[PDB]
Design a protein around this nucleic acid. Sequence first.
DNA 1: GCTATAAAAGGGCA
DNA 2: TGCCCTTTTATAGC
Length: 187
Amino acid sequence: VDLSKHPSGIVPTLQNIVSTVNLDCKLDLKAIALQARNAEYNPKRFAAVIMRIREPKTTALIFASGKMVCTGAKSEDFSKMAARKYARIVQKLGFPAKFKDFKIQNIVGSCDVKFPIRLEGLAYSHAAFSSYEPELFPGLIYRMKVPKIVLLIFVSGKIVITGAKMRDETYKAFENIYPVLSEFRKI
DNA sequence: GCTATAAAAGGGCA
DNA sequence: TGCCCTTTTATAGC
C-alpha cells in the first residue's frame, strides 16, 4: 500500500456503490416487466421494476419517470458501466433511453485494523459523534463531521464506512478514525 | 433471518 | 407535507 496516501497503510475495500441516472424518457413499467426476462415489478409493493445483471453484479430500480437507481457494484466505474448496460436493455425494449446526469450517490467501504476496540471508552470520549447501544446493535455508530461520513465500529477491529460520494471521503474518514481506534485498542 | 448505516428513486397515506 | 417502503453492502449479535 502507498504509505503516502494511506498513512495507516490500510486501504478500505469498496463494497457497494449506489448511483442514479436519468434515462430521460417515460417508461411503461408493466410493458418492461413483461418483455424483460430478468425484471420484476410489483407496484403494490414498490413502484419500480427490479432488474438485475450478472456482470457487473448489480440491481437496478427503474421508474416510470425514466429515472433509475443502480446498486451493488464494487466500484464507481463498475456502477456506471452497469447503469449503461441497463439503459441499453431499456433502449432495446423500445424506449428512447439516454444517459443523463449519472451520479454516484453513496459509496460503502470496509476494512480491518486487526486489533480489538474498547467501544465503551471510545463512545464515552467521543460522545458527540457516537451512538452505542450494544443491546440494540453490536457496533458503535460514529457520525464523523469532517468528512460528513458514518462509520460502524466493531469490537473485532472490523470497520464499515458509509455515506461518501467520492472515494477520497471514505479514505479520509478512515484515516481520521485510525488514531482514535488505536487510542481505544482493547488490551 | 433480524437489530443498525448511508444513499437514491416515487407512490401511498396520515 | 413528509415518512415508509425497496434495493444493495460490509459488519455482528439476537
